[PDB]
Amino acid sequence: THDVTTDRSQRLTLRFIPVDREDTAYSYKARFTLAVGDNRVLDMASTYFD
Amino acid sequence: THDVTTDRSQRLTLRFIPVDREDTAYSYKARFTLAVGDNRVLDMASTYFD
Amino acid sequence: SQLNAVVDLQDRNTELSYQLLLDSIGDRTRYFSMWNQAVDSYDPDVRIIE
């Protein structure tokens, strides 16, 4: 019942928009600002490019 | 004559450029880094999106 | 500090100052690709016909 989950407001899933994009001849470059807020931890396995 | 205004160099108005923008199907997202310098106070009523 | 260390004037001439500074500390006759350091000159035989 305690010390596992938050009682506070918090999203389970976040979505990030590219900060910089570059559509080229044979490739595509996407840049993001992956932000991990305070009191949070992120398991990379749970990320993916939509 | 004292303790009201600065003698120092300082802009009255600042303009901020978006740090991240996202033009979508039915909406637009704009992100800024609103910075309030030291020895300054900002009245939100005096802000607006140009 | 958020205070700008840079304070310029329309009255100042940075570019020229740098031109004159270079001449005083070295041989403006030498070229240096990195800074596009290749002084403007003319053919003496063109300026003054002999």
Curated annotation (Swiss-Prot), chains A, B:
<protein>
    <recommendedName>
        <fullName>Hexon protein</fullName>
    </recommendedName>
</protein>
<comment type="function">
    <text>Major capsid protein that self-associates to form 240 hexon trimers, each in the shape of a hexagon, building most of the pseudo T=25 capsid. Assembled into trimeric units with the help of the chaperone shutoff protein. Transported by pre-protein VI to the nucleus where it associates with other structural proteins to form an empty capsid. Might be involved, through its interaction with host dyneins, in the intracellular microtubule-dependent transport of incoming viral capsid to the nucleus.</text>
</comment>
<comment type="subunit">
    <text>Homotrimer. Interacts with the capsid vertex protein; this interaction binds the peripentonal hexons to the neighboring penton base. Interacts with the hexon-linking protein; this interaction tethers the hexons surrounding the penton to those situated in the central plate of the facet. Interacts with the hexon-interlacing protein; this interaction lashes the hexons together. Interacts with host dyneins DYNC1LI1 and DYNC1I2; this interaction might be involved in intracellular microtubule-dependent transport of incoming viral capsid.</text>
</comment>
<comment type="similarity">
    <text>Belongs to the adenoviridae hexon protein family.</text>
</comment>
